[PDB]
Coordinates of C-alpha atoms and ligand atoms in Angstrom, one line a residue:
Chain Z
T1 CA 7.3 -36.0 -12.1
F2 CA 4.7 -33.7 -10.4
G3 CA 5.2 -34.7 -6.8
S4 CA 2.8 -33.7 -4.0
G5 CA 0.5 -30.7 -4.0
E6 CA -2.1 -31.1 -6.8
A7 CA -4.8 -32.3 -4.3
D8 CA -4.7 -29.3 -2.0
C9 CA -3.6 -26.8 -4.6
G10 CA -4.9 -23.3 -4.5
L11 CA -6.2 -23.3 -0.9
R12 CA -4.2 -20.9 1.2
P13 CA -3.2 -21.9 4.8
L14 CA -3.8 -18.5 6.2
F15 CA -7.0 -17.7 4.2
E16 CA -9.3 -20.4 2.7
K17 CA -8.2 -23.0 5.2
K18 CA -9.0 -20.6 8.1
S19 CA -12.2 -19.3 6.5
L20 CA -10.6 -15.8 6.3
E21 CA -10.9 -13.5 3.3
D22 CA -8.0 -11.4 2.1
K23 CA -8.5 -7.7 1.5
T24 CA -9.3 -7.6 -2.1
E25 CA -10.4 -11.0 -3.3
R26 CA -14.1 -9.9 -3.2
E27 CA -13.2 -7.4 -6.0
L28 CA -12.2 -10.4 -8.1
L29 CA -15.3 -12.5 -7.5
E30 CA -17.7 -9.6 -7.9
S31 CA -16.1 -8.9 -11.3
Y32 CA -17.1 -12.4 -12.5
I33 CA -20.6 -12.1 -11.2
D34 CA -21.6 -8.5 -11.9
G35 CA -20.3 -7.9 -15.4
Chain U
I1 CA 3.8 -3.6 -9.5
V2 CA 2.5 -0.2 -10.4
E3 CA -0.4 1.2 -8.3
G4 CA -0.8 -1.9 -6.3
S5 CA -0.7 -2.4 -2.5
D6 CA 1.3 -4.4 0.1
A7 CA 0.3 -8.1 0.1
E8 CA -1.0 -9.6 3.3
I9 CA 1.2 -12.3 4.8
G10 CA 0.5 -15.7 3.2
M11 CA -1.7 -14.0 0.5
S12 CA 0.3 -15.5 -2.4
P13 CA 2.0 -18.6 -1.0
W14 CA 2.9 -19.8 -4.5
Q15 CA 4.9 -16.7 -5.2
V16 CA 8.5 -17.5 -6.1
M17 CA 11.4 -15.0 -6.5
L18 CA 14.0 -16.1 -9.2
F19 CA 17.3 -14.7 -7.8
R20 CA 20.6 -14.4 -9.6
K21 CA 23.5 -15.9 -7.5
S22 CA 26.2 -13.5 -8.8
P23 CA 25.7 -10.6 -8.7
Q24 CA 22.9 -10.9 -6.2
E25 CA 19.7 -9.5 -7.6
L26 CA 16.1 -10.2 -8.2
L27 CA 15.7 -11.5 -11.8
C28 CA 12.0 -12.2 -12.1
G29 CA 8.9 -13.7 -10.5
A30 CA 7.7 -17.3 -10.8
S31 CA 5.2 -19.7 -9.2
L32 CA 5.2 -22.9 -7.3
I33 CA 2.9 -25.5 -9.0
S34 CA 3.9 -28.6 -7.0
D35 CA 6.5 -29.5 -4.3
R36 CA 9.1 -29.8 -7.0
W37 CA 8.2 -27.6 -10.0
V38 CA 8.2 -23.8 -10.5
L39 CA 6.7 -22.1 -13.5
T40 CA 8.0 -18.8 -15.0
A41 CA 8.4 -17.0 -18.3
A42 CA 10.9 -18.2 -20.9
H43 CA 12.2 -14.6 -21.4
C44 CA 13.4 -14.6 -17.8
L45 CA 15.9 -17.3 -18.6
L46 CA 16.5 -17.0 -22.3
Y47 CA 16.5 -13.9 -24.5
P48 CA 19.2 -13.9 -27.2
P49 CA 18.9 -10.3 -28.2
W50 CA 20.3 -9.4 -24.8
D51 CA 22.7 -12.4 -24.8
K52 CA 20.7 -13.8 -21.8
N53 CA 20.9 -17.5 -21.3
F54 CA 20.8 -18.6 -17.7
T55 CA 21.8 -22.1 -16.7
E56 CA 20.7 -24.0 -13.6
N57 CA 23.7 -23.0 -11.6
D58 CA 23.3 -19.3 -12.2
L59 CA 20.1 -19.0 -10.2
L60 CA 18.3 -19.9 -7.1
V61 CA 14.6 -19.7 -6.2
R62 CA 13.3 -18.2 -3.0
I63 CA 9.9 -19.3 -1.8
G64 CA 7.7 -18.1 1.0
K65 CA 8.9 -14.5 1.0
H66 CA 7.3 -11.2 1.9
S67 CA 10.2 -8.7 2.3
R68 CA 12.0 -7.9 -0.9
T69 CA 15.4 -7.7 0.7
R70 CA 15.5 -9.4 4.1
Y71 CA 16.6 -13.0 4.5
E72 CA 13.5 -14.3 6.1
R73 CA 15.0 -16.9 8.3
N74 CA 12.7 -19.8 9.2
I75 CA 10.0 -18.5 6.8
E76 CA 11.5 -18.5 3.3
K77 CA 13.0 -21.4 1.5
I78 CA 15.9 -21.2 -0.8
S79 CA 16.1 -24.0 -3.4
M80 CA 18.6 -24.9 -6.1
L81 CA 17.6 -26.0 -9.6
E82 CA 18.0 -29.4 -11.1
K83 CA 16.9 -28.5 -14.7
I84 CA 15.3 -25.8 -16.8
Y85 CA 12.9 -26.5 -19.6
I86 CA 12.1 -23.8 -22.1
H87 CA 9.2 -24.3 -24.5
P88 CA 10.7 -25.5 -27.8
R89 CA 8.5 -23.1 -29.7
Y90 CA 9.2 -20.0 -27.6
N91 CA 9.4 -17.2 -30.2
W92 CA 11.9 -14.6 -29.0
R93 CA 12.5 -13.4 -32.5
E94 CA 9.1 -11.8 -33.0
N95 CA 6.5 -11.7 -30.3
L96 CA 7.3 -13.9 -27.3
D97 CA 4.8 -16.5 -28.3
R98 CA 4.8 -19.5 -25.9
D99 CA 6.7 -17.4 -23.3
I100 CA 6.9 -20.2 -20.7
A101 CA 9.5 -22.2 -18.9
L102 CA 9.5 -24.8 -16.1
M103 CA 12.2 -25.3 -13.5
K104 CA 12.6 -28.6 -11.6
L105 CA 14.0 -28.1 -8.1
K106 CA 16.9 -30.3 -7.0
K107 CA 14.7 -31.7 -4.2
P108 CA 11.1 -31.2 -3.1
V109 CA 10.1 -28.4 -0.7
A110 CA 7.9 -28.9 2.3
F111 CA 4.7 -26.7 2.3
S112 CA 4.0 -24.4 5.1
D113 CA 1.7 -21.5 5.9
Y114 CA 3.8 -19.4 3.5
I115 CA 4.6 -22.0 0.9
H116 CA 1.8 -23.7 -1.0
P117 CA 1.1 -24.5 -4.7
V118 CA -1.3 -22.7 -7.0
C119 CA -3.6 -24.8 -9.3
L120 CA -3.4 -25.1 -13.0
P121 CA -6.7 -24.5 -14.8
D122 CA -8.9 -27.2 -16.2
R123 CA -11.0 -26.5 -19.3
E124 CA -14.2 -25.5 -17.5
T125 CA -12.3 -23.0 -15.3
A126 CA -10.7 -21.5 -18.4
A127 CA -14.0 -21.4 -20.3
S128 CA -15.7 -19.6 -17.4
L129 CA -13.1 -17.2 -16.2
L130 CA -11.1 -16.0 -19.2
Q131 CA -13.6 -13.3 -20.1
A132 CA -13.2 -9.6 -20.8
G133 CA -13.7 -7.5 -17.6
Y134 CA -13.0 -10.4 -15.3
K135 CA -10.2 -9.5 -12.9
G136 CA -7.2 -11.5 -12.1
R137 CA -4.4 -10.8 -9.6
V138 CA -0.7 -10.1 -10.2
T139 CA 2.0 -10.1 -7.5
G140 CA 5.6 -9.3 -7.5
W141 CA 8.6 -7.3 -6.2
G142 CA 9.1 -5.3 -9.4
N143 CA 9.2 -1.6 -10.0
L144 CA 6.5 0.7 -8.4
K145 CA 6.6 3.4 -11.0
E146 CA 5.9 3.7 -14.7
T147 CA 7.5 7.1 -14.9
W148 CA 11.2 7.1 -14.9
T149 CA 15.0 6.7 -14.5
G150 CA 14.5 5.0 -9.7
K151 CA 11.4 3.3 -11.0
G152 CA 10.8 2.6 -7.3
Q153 CA 11.4 -0.7 -5.4
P154 CA 8.9 -2.0 -2.7
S155 CA 9.8 -3.1 0.8
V156 CA 7.4 -6.0 0.5
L157 CA 5.5 -8.1 -2.0
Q158 CA 3.0 -6.0 -4.0
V159 CA -0.4 -7.0 -5.3
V160 CA -2.8 -5.6 -7.9
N161 CA -6.0 -6.8 -9.4
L162 CA -6.4 -6.2 -13.1
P163 CA -9.3 -6.8 -15.7
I164 CA -8.8 -9.0 -18.7
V165 CA -9.1 -7.0 -21.9
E166 CA -11.2 -7.8 -25.1
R167 CA -8.9 -9.5 -27.7
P168 CA -9.6 -6.8 -30.4
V169 CA -8.6 -4.0 -28.0
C170 CA -5.4 -6.0 -27.1
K171 CA -4.5 -6.5 -30.7
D172 CA -5.3 -2.9 -31.6
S173 CA -3.0 -1.6 -28.8
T174 CA 0.2 -3.0 -30.2
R175 CA 2.0 -3.6 -33.5
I176 CA 3.3 -6.9 -32.3
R177 CA 1.5 -10.0 -33.7
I178 CA -0.6 -11.3 -30.8
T179 CA -1.3 -15.1 -30.7
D180 CA -4.0 -17.3 -29.1
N181 CA -1.3 -18.2 -26.5
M182 CA -1.4 -14.7 -25.0
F183 CA -4.0 -12.5 -23.4
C184 CA -3.8 -8.9 -22.1
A185 CA -5.1 -7.2 -19.0
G186 CA -5.2 -3.7 -17.5
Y187 CA -7.6 -0.8 -17.1
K188 CA -8.6 1.3 -20.1
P189 CA -7.8 5.0 -20.2
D190 CA -11.4 6.0 -19.3
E191 CA -11.7 3.5 -16.4
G192 CA -9.8 5.9 -14.2
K193 CA -8.2 3.1 -12.2
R194 CA -4.5 2.3 -12.8
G195 CA -2.3 -0.7 -12.0
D196 CA 0.1 -2.9 -13.9
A197 CA 3.0 -5.4 -13.7
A198 CA 6.4 -3.8 -14.2
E199 CA 10.0 -4.7 -14.7
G200 CA 10.9 -7.3 -12.1
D201 CA 7.4 -8.8 -12.0
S202 CA 7.9 -10.7 -15.3
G203 CA 7.5 -14.5 -14.9
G204 CA 5.1 -14.1 -12.0
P205 CA 1.6 -15.3 -11.8
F206 CA -1.7 -13.9 -12.9
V207 CA -4.2 -15.8 -10.7
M208 CA -8.0 -16.0 -10.5
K209 CA -10.1 -17.4 -7.6
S210 CA -12.6 -19.9 -8.8
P211 CA -16.3 -19.3 -7.8
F212 CA -16.9 -23.0 -8.2
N213 CA -14.4 -24.4 -5.7
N214 CA -12.8 -21.3 -4.2
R215 CA -9.3 -22.5 -5.2
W216 CA -6.8 -20.1 -6.8
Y217 CA -5.8 -20.9 -10.4
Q218 CA -2.9 -19.5 -12.3
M219 CA -4.3 -18.4 -15.7
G220 CA -1.4 -16.4 -16.9
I221 CA 2.3 -15.6 -16.6
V222 CA 3.5 -12.0 -16.7
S223 CA 5.1 -11.8 -20.2
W224 CA 5.6 -8.4 -21.8
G225 CA 4.3 -4.9 -22.0
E226 CA 5.0 -1.5 -23.5
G227 CA 5.3 0.9 -20.7
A228 CA 3.8 -0.4 -17.5
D229 CA 0.9 1.7 -16.0
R230 CA 0.9 3.5 -19.4
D231 CA -2.8 3.9 -20.0
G232 CA -3.7 2.9 -23.6
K233 CA -1.1 0.1 -23.3
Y234 CA -1.8 -3.2 -21.7
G235 CA 0.2 -6.0 -20.1
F236 CA 0.5 -9.3 -22.0
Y237 CA 0.3 -12.7 -20.3
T238 CA 1.1 -16.2 -21.4
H239 CA -2.1 -18.2 -21.6
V240 CA -1.4 -21.1 -19.2
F241 CA -4.4 -23.2 -20.1
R242 CA -3.5 -23.2 -23.8
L243 CA 0.0 -24.4 -22.9
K244 CA -1.0 -26.9 -20.2
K245 CA -0.4 -30.0 -22.4
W246 CA 3.3 -28.9 -22.7
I247 CA 3.5 -28.4 -19.0
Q248 CA 2.1 -31.9 -18.3
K249 CA 4.4 -33.5 -21.0
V250 CA 7.4 -32.0 -19.3
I251 CA 6.4 -33.0 -15.7
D252 CA 5.4 -36.5 -16.7
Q253 CA 8.7 -36.9 -18.6
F254 CA 11.1 -35.9 -15.8
Ligands
NAG1 C1 20.4 -19.3 -28.7 C2 21.2 -19.6 -27.6 O1 21.8 -18.8 -27.0 N1 21.2 -20.9 -27.2 C3 22.0 -21.4 -26.0 C4 23.0 -22.6 -26.5 O2 23.9 -22.1 -27.5 C5 23.8 -23.0 -25.3 O3 24.7 -24.1 -25.7 C6 22.8 -23.6 -24.2 C7 23.4 -24.1 -23.0 O4 23.9 -23.0 -22.2 O5 21.9 -22.4 -23.8 C8 21.1 -22.0 -25.0

């Protein structure tokens, strides 16, 4: 069946887990907040 | 990817490359959803009009990649397939409705800084984020140009952010019968900005970062288009949330 992974899905080792933001993710989030 | 940019290392750790064993070539994109399951588009594996019908032994999946061509020793992971599941209602005859397929790996993969699963959406994430104007992100190793004949090939994984388009504008843009299991994305002619998935990016993920828990969720699968980067035309994506019950039925069945 599924296997491991669900619990920690979607959190990137080199970004979210290190509190670092990639170059263009803010463009995505601002699009949800601004209009 | 047309009009995108180079991905940063580890930016899309769920990105999977579907590779044809013989001849050796990139077939499509896909995504890692657990340590043993990969999600892609049904048309990447089965399309009767082109006498395309790949079996488990014809392909391999490559996870953790950045370079399009280099064998990334000690970074990428090459996995064989145990079984392929195509949605039983995949409509290749008309409109590619339910363009979704699952692939079970022969054995689970270990996660790393470069290999990590994306989340599938829950109903609140779908309700909040699938809205016109909201942007998602598409990644892949497909063509760089809309234009012509080389269509351009990237040295490394490409990324582009694209806005979801209002359903009436999507429907109005094509003669194909669009269903509730599909959505479209891309910039409109007067938005000035460009960007699109192209040939080779099919099957890959359209992801959105949740403002609620800051996890990345796969909301779509690159499905079909009519001229990538062609303003006035938009790319179509399989609506993952709408087909989530089928995904869960398959995974909790094998
Ligand atoms: C419409 C079509 O091509 N269906 C093929 C079926 O005939 C074949 O037996 C199976 C296994 O390869 O793959 C699928």
